[PDB]
Each structure stands twice: as structure tokens, then as C-alpha cells.
Amino acid sequence: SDTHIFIIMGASGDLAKKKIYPTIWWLFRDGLLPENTFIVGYARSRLTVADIRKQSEPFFKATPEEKLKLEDFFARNSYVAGQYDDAASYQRLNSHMNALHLGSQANRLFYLALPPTVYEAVTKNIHESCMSQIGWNRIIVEKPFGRDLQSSDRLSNHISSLFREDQIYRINHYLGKEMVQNLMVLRFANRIFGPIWNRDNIACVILTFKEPFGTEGRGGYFDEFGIIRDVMQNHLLQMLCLVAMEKPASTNSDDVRDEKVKVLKCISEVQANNVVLGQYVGNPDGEGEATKGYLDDPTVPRGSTTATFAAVVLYVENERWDGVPFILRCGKALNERKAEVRLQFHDVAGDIFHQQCKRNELVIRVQPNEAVYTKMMTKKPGMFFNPEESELDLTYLPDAYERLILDVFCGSQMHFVRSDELREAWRIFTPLLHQIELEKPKPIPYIYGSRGPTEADELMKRVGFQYEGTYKWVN
Amino acid sequence: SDTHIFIIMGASGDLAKKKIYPTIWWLFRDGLLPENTFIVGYARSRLTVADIRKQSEPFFKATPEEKLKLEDFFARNSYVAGQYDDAASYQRLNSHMNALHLGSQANRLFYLALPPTVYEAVTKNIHESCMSQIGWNRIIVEKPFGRDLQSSDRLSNHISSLFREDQIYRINHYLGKEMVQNLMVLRFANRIFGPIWNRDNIACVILTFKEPFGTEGRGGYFDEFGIIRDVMQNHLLQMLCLVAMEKPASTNSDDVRDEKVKVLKCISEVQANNVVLGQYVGNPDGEGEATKGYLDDPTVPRGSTTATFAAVVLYVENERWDGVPFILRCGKALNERKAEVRLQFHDVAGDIFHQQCKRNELVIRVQPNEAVYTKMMTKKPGMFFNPEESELDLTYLPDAYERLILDVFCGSQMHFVRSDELREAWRIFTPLLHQIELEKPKPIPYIYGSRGPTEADELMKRVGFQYEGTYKWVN
Amino acid sequence: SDTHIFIIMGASGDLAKKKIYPTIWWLFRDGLLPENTFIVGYARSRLTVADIRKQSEPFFKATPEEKLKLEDFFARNSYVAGQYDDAASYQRLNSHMNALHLGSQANRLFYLALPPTVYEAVTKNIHESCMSQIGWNRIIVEKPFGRDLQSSDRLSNHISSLFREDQIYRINHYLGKEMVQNLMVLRFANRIFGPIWNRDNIACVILTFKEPFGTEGRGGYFDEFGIIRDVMQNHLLQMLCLVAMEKPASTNSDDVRDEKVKVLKCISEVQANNVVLGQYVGNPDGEGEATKGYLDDPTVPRGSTTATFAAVVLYVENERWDGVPFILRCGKALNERKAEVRLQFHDVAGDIFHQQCKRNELVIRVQPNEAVYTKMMTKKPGMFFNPEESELDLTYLPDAYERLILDVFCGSQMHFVRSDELREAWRIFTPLLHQIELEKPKPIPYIYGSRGPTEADELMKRVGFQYEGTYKWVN
Amino acid sequence: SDTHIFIIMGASGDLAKKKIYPTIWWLFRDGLLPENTFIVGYARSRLTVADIRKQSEPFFKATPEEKLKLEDFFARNSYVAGQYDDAASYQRLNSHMNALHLGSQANRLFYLALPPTVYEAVTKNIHESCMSQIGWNRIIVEKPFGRDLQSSDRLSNHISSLFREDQIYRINHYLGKEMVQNLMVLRFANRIFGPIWNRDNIACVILTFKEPFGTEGRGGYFDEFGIIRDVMQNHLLQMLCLVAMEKPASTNSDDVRDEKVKVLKCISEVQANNVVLGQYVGNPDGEGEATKGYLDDPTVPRGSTTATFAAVVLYVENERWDGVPFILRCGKALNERKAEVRLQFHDVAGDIFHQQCKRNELVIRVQPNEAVYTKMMTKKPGMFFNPEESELDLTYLPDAYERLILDVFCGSQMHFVRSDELREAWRIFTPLLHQIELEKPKPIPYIYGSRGPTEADELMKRVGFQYEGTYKWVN
Ligand SMILES: NC(=O)c1ccc[n+]([C@@H]2O[C@H](COP(=O)([O-])OP(=O)(O)OC[C@H]3O[C@@H](n4cnc5c(N)ncnc54)[C@H](OP(=O)(O)O)[C@@H]3O)[C@@H](O)[C@H]2O)c1
Ligand SMILES: NC(=O)c1ccc[n+]([C@@H]2O[C@H](COP(=O)([O-])OP(=O)(O)OC[C@H]3O[C@@H](n4cnc5c(N)ncnc54)[C@H](OP(=O)(O)O)[C@@H]3O)[C@@H](O)[C@H]2O)c1
Numbered sequence A, B, C, D: 001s002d003t004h005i006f007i008i009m010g011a012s013g014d015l016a017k018k019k020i021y022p023t024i025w026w027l028f029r030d031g032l033l034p035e036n037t038f039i040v041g042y043a044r045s046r047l048t049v050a051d052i053r054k055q056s057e058p059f060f061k062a063t064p065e066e067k068l069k070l071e072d073f074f075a076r077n078s079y080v081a082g083q084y085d086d087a088a089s090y091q092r093l094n095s096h097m098n099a100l101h102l103g104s105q106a107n108r109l110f111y112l113a114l115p116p117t118v119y120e121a122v123t124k125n126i127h128e129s130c131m132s133q134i135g136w137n138r139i140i141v142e143k144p145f146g147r148d149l150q151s152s153d154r155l156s157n158h159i160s161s162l163f164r165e166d167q168i169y170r171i172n173h174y175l176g177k178e179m180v181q182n183l184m185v186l187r188f189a190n191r192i193f194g195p196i197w198n199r200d201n202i203a204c205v206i207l208t209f210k211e212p213f214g215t216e217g218r219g220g221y222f223d224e225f226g227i228i229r230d231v232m233q234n235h236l237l238q239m240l241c242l243v244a245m246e247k248p249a250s251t252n253s254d255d256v257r258d259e260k261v262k263v264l265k266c267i268s269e270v271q272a273n274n275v276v277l278g279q280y281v282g283n284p285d286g287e288g289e290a291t292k293g294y295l296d297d298p299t300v301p302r303g304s305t306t307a308t309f310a311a312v313v314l315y316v317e318n319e320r321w322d323g324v325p326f327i328l329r330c331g332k333a334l335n336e337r338k339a340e341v342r343l344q345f346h347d348v349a350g351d352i353f354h355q356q357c358k359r360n361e362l363v364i365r366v367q368p369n370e371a372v373y374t375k376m377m378t379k380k381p382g383m384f385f386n387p388e389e390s391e392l393d394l395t396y397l398p399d400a401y402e403r404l405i406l407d408v409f410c411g412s413q414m415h416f417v418r419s420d421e422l423r424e425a426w427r428i429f430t431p432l433l434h435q436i437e438l439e440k441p442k443p444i445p446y447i448y449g450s451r452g453p454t455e456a457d458e459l460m461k462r463v464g465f466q467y468e469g470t471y472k473w474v475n
């Protein structure tokens, strides 16, 4: 078995200490990492391994039973202090990596837990000095991947000029979730969902990502990006790609991402008449943080028109999806947390039940709870021939971040955004973002803890989604 | 509201006193019958209303709370004695009905609770004497409807020579069942079951009717008919009609039965190579009645070759169902009681999961514990890309006999066998029955309480059904 | 071979002498008739077989070569004079038929070449007297089959109370045409036309029946009926049934007509907003009869609002045809003679040719120059990838009337109107005709020899047909 | 307009003088070339422009009408003598091309009319020296592209290590033909061919490429490759890709070639039991060249087992084409010249015409006499409901080589083989070629001018093509 080096650049970061070190700790605890794996930190701060332990222990969730295993894990941890644009520091880091046991032929896995501003310099210096000559070299890149098409293209071209596509792992936490990964099996392993997954049967597709909390203090970081860049551009667009994607030639990462980019290439730029933007305000009847609006945050610049809610309608102009509205819906400070995929089917042609039938709906809920159910019509128990709404419910381990790190280790790139997919997403959403920043349109206020602006429901009804509300469900 | 007269002719019979009088009582108690309803008996034996009450109270399921309603219901009861082929007795019956309040313009409902041996004279005399000149006159005919094509045609032609098709209600108890009626709503009120309900997606259709008990003493009655005449000719064939039926022009009884006859007309005569026959033997390890075989029943003639189990393969040679085998499976003294419709779908074209996928199966269980579920593949919780078997479960008043009698009262003929339906069924099953009764083939023995002969499973596998056995289910 | 008697009542009429006698003559000349066939005329006016021959020979197309065959044909011809409501005259007719050679056991074929005003009396007398007790008895009934639903139902009930549905042959010469009969073979014998023959691929259906001549003197006959009763109710509706009908269980006449009536039962009543009516005026620049308008006919009542042109939109509200408009267009004094069926298909979904693609069209031209072609896109010969409109063309005996008479002889009722089909057709068109006859709407005038009112084209464009005009065809 | 330099490497070759110089001559004559276009030759043998004239005007198709334009064409011609592996000679060529007017900024188009033995050196030295710094540089590479997967991978890796994929134009003279390019418009611009172009409707696909002549005096050259490498690996495989490919996202060359390689990736390696090989023998009753067999050629080594005929069956294991056999048929010295795409459709489900219907066939004849027709069933003019086979027939400039060169000039790579396409084709056909070369199986002899071995027809029948032979066609 080959040896591996997990280089954590910016190991002093909050993201590092709270998510990366605990994740590799759990992976080593479960015996999932390669046996010969060395964790090497790298940041400008003068820190030590004890200095690390002190900062990472309360997030480690370490019970006293496995203190020996924790000591064994932290034995292989090491830290190098250096600057992100200092060739001498990068040479020192490379020398230290070669100083570890069998470090010259080790597989190098650099995790860039850094702000995007230093990504170019870090990648350039890594490619210059710290690349292994025998093993592979894979780089984990964190969002944001630029703020528009031009900046994203600049960063992507800089990274791609040095590293191959198989060496770049743009990490998205949402792509590793079980229901998100179950979408391909649900679609392509079942005959029941095959013939109906087209424009001849589906009336509209609704993709939802709701959060019940606001900016909760760190509103200044969210102000410069907005909800479209936060959620719509990546989460909902990956959901759309999985829902609308053709069947791949195989389960290979290249084939899956080829289908995803092919679907993305058939989407036109978003227009402002298909977009509803909202910004949450305080709830006087609420408790705690519900009473504070988006602008009530001191870190948020005054007079900000950043949208905390967005509802856009996309169209995939291909054979399978021509004319089917794809409604992307997300927001913050909403009434509940939910990540959902909903397919509303057309009315049954030649209805013989006197307009009593409702549209079939297939729902794939990703969170809070995993649930795949289809709403369908069934005969009402009684005397007359009246259908009523019913439902078929689907009846029925490392977490998503751990599986993503294991995917980087094992070379599976199907859960990571490719360069062409990123370019297509940015080209889809860039004219709208440019118009928004140029004109500063006022978002529609909505009360903290509500469902959002009513204009979103109006847009859904206009594009084709008919909400009934008469469907009653009991657990 | 017009007056209705329910003439239970044969009121001294076991079927009458055990099912018809209690059903009429329950319908009257719930108020489902019209407010002006008179029940008139007719049989050779000389009884009275007191005698009928005495012999029907044990099966009455009455309570002391509504003894007043009991006495009110028997207040409208009456009885005319006489011969079933006596013009004077039928004149007396007609005169009694006229002497009843509003009895000349009253609707007359004749229930023929008599052996088919007298049906000819009974119906002829009813038409000649007891026909009402104002209200409608409908006759309820009980099984058997003949033993083969020729006898059934004789009886049906004689009955139709007197009564119109809208006056004949050939009753079978299973068409009034909840899932049997829900099949049409499931098929034609839902978009998700439309495009897949054809030969391009469905590999085979299995219609199952299993019972856990044998002839239990009355084997002489079953010896004259056999399992094919008892179950396949009516129950499983109605199931096949409902499953393979085209969408009717409307929910009218004429349209529904027209579609059913159209489906029946596309089925060729049953061939012997597609039939597996079985006769149950005793279980040495059984408990009580289960230890006696079919030939171990006094009433059963020695050397009888009457099959208690049958498994035939039918084909609906039309555009929707060409090449799809319809497997009709029924038997007695089997391992369980079950009426079920199972659709097995084809393999997903262009498999990308390395042959790990299993065929989708839609199951509609009429009884026991009615349920609709689809066996389908879902992603196995883990790291690798492997599907696993799961299912979507459908989640969630007078019974079939009173619903059928209410249908006769209302004039709905949807759940009653039409003359052309009967003719098509008999022309389908008549060459096989004649061959069986001529060559006297020996049925394959199977132990009381088993799944039947293994030749049935071999036939299912040959025609295309592939059983897996790897699908494990827990409530 | 059994002997046949062909009774032509109204043998002195123009229809008889110009179509029936020549047709029987040609059938006998070609040997298509049964060997022992006798032709018996019947009319009030007294004449002889010599008079019939003298008055019918110009239309006989007789040549000196077959003079002996002509004398053999007239050796079997006979004439009987009598009233249409005289039992004595009908007894004399029966006696003549019986005195004919093997006339008591012959097959009797009554052609009612009479106005419908005496149809009831003729049929009643036929049933009372002239029925054959050994051979079959079939009557041929000519249009009009009533003026509305009520009159049609009255006449149909009178005829059906005396004759079975298998004895009534309501003759419509349009159903006997080659392309009209080839519609079924084209639809149900070809895999290419199967999957596309539904609402998911067809945008609209146009049924056209144009005539280039006006009433031509006999406008008084046309005034009380109009174009809807003349052409729409029978020719266009039969073509609609054949185009929209489901696949029959077999090629039996009963199955085909069951499918036709099943389609007719799915069509709602015609609404006035889906109807364009027109009445032609004279062409001042025309030559001959083209200069006279509809009202210029002296027999036409002054100020008549009878429409010589109609364009209605019908909808077949079933699974296959839900939402597809069926445009029925017929008119007199138009620019050409044409009987055509046109299916315009939907635009290709996800078009990759920059909107250069035109809708596919399947055209079945019944007359003149019966041709089947489909307009399709092909690559333009050149350097760029531009599709251009092209087409696939179909490439290379008794006529319709003799075919229909032979069908009556051999007992095939496929190309004849059934009672339920007639009832559904009048159900569809009766409220509109009543509204027209009550409100007396003024038809849109149009010039003799034109394409009709432009409101018809506007209605087609509104309901969904898009005329291109860029399609160029060269013979 | 930019200036272009068309460098003809190996300009003294037979291919050059017979096809390339006439093609650019015609392009310049018709004003399709760029206005500033200089043609430069380069070969080891010391010729001049006068020698090029003396050797190329026999095939120039030049008439005295355009003699001035001819002399203007060779006014822009030039010739440079040098070795194909000489850095000094290639520097001299670069100096000449710079000395051309505006040759420093000119677009460079290197046509490699050379044997593949020197391709590596020529490409490496072209990249080293003769690459423009402002204009683009495109290289046209001729077949063969290696003899198997390993050699093809070697050559492709060597070429791609220097030139980008957008700079390499692997020329296949077949992809530029009119009928070949119309396949994509026929499939994706027409709704009539959409729903039926799948496995649910198509029984088998036959791809044919027949020649009526053997290997006239060049059997020694054909011997080293064989029919599979000559025709099957490129022509028939490109035809298969065009027939079976999914709809591209757009008409971009990259999208089209991605679809093509995606289809290629779904094909497994060819098995020997699906391959029929043949080698033509002399015809004793033939005339002239037909009397000599393949081994009668003195250039053919004695005992050669090279196949001049091949019939293989391929399968595209994806959702659209799973189970449909793709029969590739090619051979030399056959009965005719023909290249054709034939799609035989399945039998119509639920036949109601008593097994008289034949399978529909869609035929796209690339050459000779480009035609598209669909064999289909139509009613036989007569008395009975009897279908008979008919056909819908498609109805009534630079050549393929000129259009391919113009495509290179315009930068269109749609009709050129990509690296992944070549690699996938060699992967498909390499195990079979290795097995043939190792085991040396004897090809089945067939007579010059016949249809080939009967084993090919047997294999077609076995895989599913049912030849009828009852279809009659007249022009
Ligand atoms: N649970 C069931 O029993 C059951 C279930 C399914 C279907 N059925 C069908 O329902 C029908 C009702 O018959 P059943 O079950 O009630 O049997 P049943 O009791 O033997 O016959 C009903 C009554 O008819 C009279 N009867 C019997 N045999 C007769 C004969 N040869 N001729 C004239 N009258 C005769 C008898 O009364 P009188 O002596 O006064 O004439 C008898 O009480 C039968 O055809 C049976 O096939 C019954
Ligand atoms: N080519 C056509 O004209 C044509 C085409 C299609 C359908 N039809 C239908 O076929 C039927 C035949 O009519 P037709 O065209 O032949 O015109 P017709 O001459 O008026 O009818 C034919 C015979 O009907 C008799 N007749 C006329 N008026 C009568 C009346 N009030 N009472 C009793 N008998 C009367 C006459 O016989 P006697 O004078 O000897 O009593 C006449 O010879 C019509 O209903 C017409 O709608 C005709």
C-alpha cells in the first residue's frame, strides 16, 4: 500500500480546525484512511502540534476510550510555518515532506483551506516545488470559485494551466449527500421512472433549498456574494443537472460529469422577469434572532439590496426537457429547513373522472429527512367512483464530508465540480448577477420565518406549477 | 321515490338464509335501501315469516339495541309458497306483489337463489307472469353460468330471449371488492402508471388467487366443476380484463364492459402446453383437516382427476399486450390466502450497474390486508455505487355483497358479467376443459399447505417470470 | 351458389337510372355478381323493361361488343308497378318475386332509391310482405338520414323496429373510396406510423373536402340542408373516425364500427365560436357558371342564409387525442376539387437548427390523384448545414359504388353507417344546426373559385395550424 | 481577409497530383478559397512548378476557357525540395514561406500527402520549425491511422504531443458526402423519425459498403490491411455513429463528435462468432478482370488469407439501442457498388391482417443515386382487406473532397475523426484483428461479382434480419 501526505494549507483556519482535522481524525479512527498517511499543516501562524490539539480537541468528539488511537493519530501530525508566496517556505515544506518516512514517493493531497485571494500563488508555488515525482498530486479547492464568469474563468485558467483536470477536486459539501447520490440510481436503475422522465409527462420541476436561520451575525461575508452565488449557482444547479441529466455511458466520473455539462450547455441565460428576489426583515412576534432583520446586522452595509431569497425559472432546451420549467427556489430565514426535488406531472389525457384527479407529484426530499414519495390518485373508500389523493412512500457510516475526503483519496471525481460545468453555471447566472449589481433592484421584504415573498408563488403559478393544498398527510 | 320489491325466491336455501337475508337486513339498517322496500319469499317448502326469522337470526348479527328495527324489517317481509314451474303459483306471487302497497308500479328485483337446473323455468315464468308494466325488473343470476361454451350459450340465449341486457345482473362477489374497483382509478387517474402499462415495459403479468383450505367436506360439489371453472373462468379472468383493459370512453358501465369484452376478444384458446394442473394430497405432518387429501373425502368419487390447482398462461394479442404472458394462478389447500395482481417490468435497457439491478415489480394485493407497492431499486447506504431492492408503499362501510346489491338497486352494471363477457370467457376456456374431461389427465399432486406443484414455477420461469428470492421485507 | 333478387324501388328515378342500373350492369358484365341474380324494379309510374333500357342505356356505357351480354342482363330484369303504401301492390311484388325462378328461397336485396319521405312506409310494407323466409333480406338506405338528431332518431327507430342492424346498409359512397379504405392499412399495418399517431406528436389534424362547382341549378335542394348536413356530417366525420380510431380487435365490420363509434362518443358538441360559415357569391371576372352566386339561383329562396362553406374545429377528448384540434373544412364553388387528410406534427423538441425547421406534415389525399406523402426536412445541397423542406412520396377494377354494392352482396357492413354512429354524429352537430336555423347568422361571402373566407384560415391559425407557404413542390 | 498558405507535403505523390492539386484548383476556380492563398509543395525529388504542371494537368479538368485563371493559379504555386527529416531543409521551407507575401502572419495548412512511416518526423519537425506565430496551423492527416490499437495510440500520442486537437484534421473522404451529412438532419430535424428511432421499434440496423471491383494490381497493398481495416474500421463505423448517436447539444463540431465517441464507448469488442469473412476467387464465366481471383494477383503473397469481405455484428449497449444488432457489411469484387443504411423495424404488435404484413424498412442509400425511402404496407387495390408492400420515396457544387478542404479552411472539425473516436474504433476492432492475424483462419471463397458468402446472409438471419424477397419496385 502506497503512503499518503494530507497537506493542510492554512491549517490555522476556522474551517480547518472545525471541520478538516476532525474529519481526518474520524476517518483514521474508523480505519478508512490509508495506513501510511501523514497530516502536514502549513500556515503563516507560528503554531505547534500541541497548539493545534488545543484548538481542535472540542470539535474532535474524542471519547476517553480511544485516547491511545488519538495519540497515534496526532503522532503523524506536523506543522510547517511559512508564507503563502515565499519560495523559501515552500522549499522548506517540500524538504519536510521528503523528510517523512517514504515521503519522496508518497501521494500528495493538498487541501487549500485558504481565502481565494491567495489561491493563485499557492497553486503556482505547489506546482513549482511541492509536487511528488512518483505519486499523484491532487488539490482540493474550496468555494467561492470566483464571483462571476470572468473572475471564475481567470482562476480556473490559472489552476488548469498547472494541474490537470484529474488533479483538481473542487469540493462541494452537498454533492456527497445520500439522497443526492441516490438520484442516479432512482432514475437509471428503475424501469418505472424511465418512460415518464421527459417533457411529455412532466409539467414542472421544482428544486428547493430552504434554511430557517438568517445570516446569524456574519452578514458581511454574505453581503458580498448573495443567495444566488451561495446556493443557486452550485447546490440547486447540481440538483438540476442530476434531475435532467441523460443516462451516462457508464458509472465513471468522466461520463457522469459529461452528462451534467451536456445538460448545462442546453440552458439559456436567466432573465430578470423569471427571477424573484427577496430580503428578510425582522419578526416582531418572533423570539431571539427572529426579531432582527437582514439590515439589523451591524456588519451588513447600510442600504444593502442583497437578496437573501431567490426564485428563478430555468429551461433545458433539449429533446427531453423542452418547455419544462425548472424552478430553482432557495432562501434564508424561511419557515423551515428543506432540500427537495419535486416533479409535478401533467394531467392525465382524456380524463374520465370529471376533473376530480390531481396532478401526480414525485418528491425526493434530501433533508431534513430522506424521503422519496410519489403523490397519486386512489379510489375513495365508499360507494361512488371518486378518486382521492394518496401517496407511495419509500420505506426503510461516514458523513458527507468524510465520503468526499475518501473520494479525493480514492480518485473518484464524480462528486466534484468540473471546469466546464463551473463555466456553464457562471455563464448561465452571470448576466443576471451583473444586472443586479448594476441596477441595485430592491428585494421584496419578507418576515423572518415565513415562506418568502408571494411573488415567488405567483411566478411558480405563472410558469406552470399548480399548488392544490388539499393533499393531507399523516405520519 | 318508487317502491322496490325484492323477491328472494328460494328463501329456504342456505345461501339465502346465510348471505341474502342478512345483507338485506344490514342495507335496511343503514338505510341504503329505498324507504319503500318489500321483501317477498318464494319456495316450494311451506314456511312463514316466523320460520324465516328463526332460521336467519343466528347469521343475522343483530343486537338488542335495534330489536325494534328488526321487527320493522320483518314487518315488510312476506312469503309465497309454490312450485317453480307452476303458473298458478306464479299468478299467486304476482297477485301478492300487486296487493302489496304501491305494488303495481313498484320496481321488482328478483334474486334467483336457486340451482341453475330450474333457472330456465324460473326466468320464463317471471317474464310471462311477474313482469311489472311500470317499474323496471332486474334479475340477479348466481353462478355457475353453465359448465362450458355450449351450455352457457344455451342458458344465456334463453335468458336474453326474455330479458334485456340492462335487466340481467349476473352476480360475482369479487368485482365488488375495493382493490378490484380501485384498479381502474390506479390505472387511469395517474400519469405515473400510464406510459409503463404496455408491452414495451412490462415483462409478465401474474394474477394469483390462493386459498389455504381444501374442499373441506363438500368435495362432491367441486368435483363437477373444477378449479378452472370455479376461479379461473370468473375471478382471474375479471382480474385480467381490469389489468389489460384499455381506457374506457367514460366511467359508464357499458363503456367499461365494452373495453373488458374487447380485451377478452384478443385472447386465443388456451393450449395444453401452457397449463399446469394439480390436486392436493394429505399432509402427514398436518393438524386436523389439513391431513386429508382431495381423494380422502367421502363425497369425492374414487379415482377423480379433478384439479384443485391450475396455472395457465394467456396472451392478449393486441397492440398493448402482444407477447406479454398473463400467468393465471389459483388453487386450494395452498400455503396462504391471497388475491394479488403482480406486474414484473423488463430489465432496464443499457444497464450501467453491472447486472446488480433487479426487475421492477408493481404489486396490487386485493386480499388479505389490501396493499399496493412497487418493488424498485435504490442506492445502498455506503460508499460504493451499488443499488439495492426497496419499495414504495401505498399508505393509509358495506362490503362487496351489499355494495353489489346496492349496485343492482341503483342500476349500475359495471361489476356484473355481461353476456358477451361470459361468451368470450367460455370460448377461451372451453377447448381446455373438453380436453381435460376427455383425456382425464392426472393432476400433479401437492401436499396440503404447500405452494402447489413446482411445475407451475417452472412454467412461470419458461414464459418469462424470473423469481429472485433476494428481496427481504420487514414491517 | 344461392340465387339473389336485387329489388330497385324507385327504379324510374334519376339516381336509379344514372347510378344503380349502370352499376349492376357493370358488375354483371365483369362477372362479380352471383350467377343467379335477378333485378326487379318498382315504382308507381307504369313502364316496362324496354322503357328502363331506353331511359338508362346512355349511362350504361354499352358497346356493340357485349350486346349479347346486355340482352342476357335484361333477360333477368323485370319491372313491377305499384304504390309505396299499398298492401295489394306489395303483395303483387312478392308474388312476382316468388314466381321468379327459385324466388322463394332467394336472397333479397332492396335498394331504396326513393326520397326519405316514403322510407317508413316502404320499410314497413317490406317487412310485412316481401321478406324472404329462407334467404337473407338486406335493405340499402340512402341519405339524407334525417335532418337533425330528433328526425334521425325517429327514422332510425322506425327502421330498427322492423330490421336488425345486420340487415340495414346505410350507403355512403365516400366510405368506399380507395384512400378512405387504405387509411386503416396505413395506420395499423405500419410500424412507422404507430408511435407518432397521438397527441404527443401531432399538433393538428385537417380534414378537407372542396368542390370547384356551386349548386349548378339545383340550389333549392341544397337550401334546406346546407353544407354541414351535406358533407361535414358524413364524409368529414367518417374520415375523422378513421383517422382518430383506435386499433380494432380484428378486421371485422363490428369491431371497426365499434372503434368508430367509440371515437365519436368522445367528441363534444360543436360550439359556435369554433365555426366559420360562408356562402359563395358570383365572380364578375368568371366565365360561365362562375359568374352566378348562390342567391342568383332562382330556385334558392331570396335572402337565404344557407352556408355553402363551413369550417369547424372538433376535439376528441380521449387519451390519444386530448387537445389536438380536428379542423373539418368543406365548401362549394371553391378553387379546386380535393378530399384530403393532413396531419401537422409538432415542432421537434430541442431544435438544434436555429428555428429553420418546419413542422412535419403527413398528407393523405383521397381525390383527385390519390397520393400519400409526408413533408419532412432534408439537408440543403451546399456547404452549410441548413435543412430544407422536402417530402417522401408514395409510388405506383370496380369503383366505389360497385365496391359498396358488392359489400352488400357479400354481407360486409364495414363501409356503412351504423345507428349509434349516426346518432353520435347528429349529437355532435345538432345544437349548432339548431342555433343556425334559429338565429339565422349571415354567412361570410366569398367569391366563386376562391379558397373561401379568410376567417377559416384565421380559425385554423388560432387553433394551432401554422401555414408556411415556403414549401415548394415540383412534379 | 487573412492570407493562407496551403502546404502540400509530398506534392510529387500520386495522391497529390491526382486529387489534391485538382481540388484546390477547382476551389480557386470557383472562388471558394481565400483570396490570398499560396500553394507550396515540398518533396525530396527535385521537381519544379513546370514538372508539377506536366504531371497534374492530365487530371486537372482544365479547359481553354479559363487558361488565364489557370496561369494565375500556378502564379501562386511554389515548390521547395528537401528531406522530410532534415532540419536544414525544413528551415529552408520556413524561409520560403516567410518570403511569401504576408507569409509571417499567414494561416498555415499542412496537407500530409505522405506514407505514415514519415508522419512522426514530418509532424515533429513542422512543430519545431514551420509553425506560424500569428495565424493558425492545421494539419490534414490521411489514412491509415495505424494498423491496430497500439500503433494507432503511438501515432496519435506523438501527433497530439505537439498539435492540439483543434489543429488536427484526420481526413475521411466519406464523412463529406451529401447523404452522409444529411443523416443528422433526417434524424434530428424531423418529428416523424424521432419516436421510432429506438430499440422499441427497430429490429436491426444494416450498414452496407459494397464494391464491384477487386484489388486491381494493388492486392499487395491491400493485403497488409484487409477489408476490416480498409472500410469497416472507418466508413461503416462512422455510419454507425451517425445512425445511433444521441441528439447533440448543438450543431457544434465538438458536440457532434462527443455524441459520436459516446456511442462508440457503448460498443463491446467484436466476437469471432459474429464475424463472417470472405476472399473473392476468379470467375470462369466473367469478362476481363472478373476472371482473376484475389490470389491470382502476382503482387499478393502466395497463401494469403486476407479477407476481401467482412460481415460483423455490433451492439450498442445503451438505453436507446440495447439488443438491436448492427450488421456491418463490406466487401470487394461484389455484384454492385452500393453504400446504404437500412433500418428494419419490428413487426406491428397485434397484427389484424393475418400475418400478411412485412416489416417496415427505412433505407438511406448514400451511393450510387442518393435516395431515402421507407418500405411500408399499403392496401392492395381490389376487393379484400389485403395489405401489400409499397414505399415512400424522397424526391428530387463542390464534391466531398472540396467540401472537406473548405471545412478545414473554415475550421469545422465535424466531419473529421477525433483522437478518442479513433482510439475507441481501434479498441472495438483490435482483438478480432489480432485473433485473425494469429490464427490465420481461411476466409470463405466467393465468386467475383456475387453477393458474397452465404454465411453472411445466414449470420444476418441469425441475428434478426428477415429478408422477404417479395418486395417489387419499379422506377
Ligand atoms: N354459500 C352458497 O351456498 C353459495 C355460494 C356461491 C354461489 N351459490 C349459488 O347460489 C345459488 C343458490 O343455491 P343454494 O346455495 O341456496 O343451494 P340450495 O339451498 O340447495 O337451494 C336453494 C333452495 O332452492 C330449493 N331447491 C334446492 N334444490 C332444488 C331443486 N332441484 N329444484 C328446485 N328447487 C330446489 C330449495 O328450496 P325448496 O325445497 O323450497 O324448493 C333450496 O332451499 C346456487 O346456484 C349456488 O351455485 C351458493
Ligand atoms: N344521384 C342522386 O340523385 C343521388 C345521390 C345520392 C343520394 N341520393 C338520394 O337517393 C334518393 C333517391 O332520390 P332521387 O335522386 O332518385 O330523386 P327522385 O327522382 O325524386 O326519386 C326517385 C323516385 O322516387 C319517386 N318519388 C319521387 N317523389 C316521390 C314522392 N313524393 N312520393 C313517392 N315517390 C316519389 C319517384 O318514383 P315514381 O314517380 O314512379 O313514383 C322517383 O322515380 C334521394 O333521397 C336522394 O337524397 C340521390
Ligand SMILES: NC(=O)c1ccc[n+]([C@@H]2O[C@H](COP(=O)([O-])OP(=O)(O)OC[C@H]3O[C@@H](n4cnc5c(N)ncnc54)[C@H](OP(=O)(O)O)[C@@H]3O)[C@@H](O)[C@H]2O)c1
Pocket (backbone or CB within 6 Å): D010, D011, D012, D013, D014, D015, D016, D018, D019, D043, D044, D045, D046, D084, D112, D113, D114, D115, D116, D117, D118, D142, D143, D144
Ligand atoms: N489516391 C491515393 O493513393 C490515396 C488515397 C487515399 C489516401 N491515401 C493516403 O495518402 C498517402 C499519400 O501517399 P500516396 O498515395 O501519394 O503514394 P506515394 O506517391 O508513393 O507517396 C507520396 C510521396 O511521398 C514520397 N514518398 C514515397 N515514399 C516515401 C517514403 N518511404 N518515405 C518518404 N517519402 C516517400 C514520395 O515523394 P518524394 O520521393 O519526392 O519524397 C511520393 O511521391 C498514402 O499513404 C495513402 O495511405 C492515398
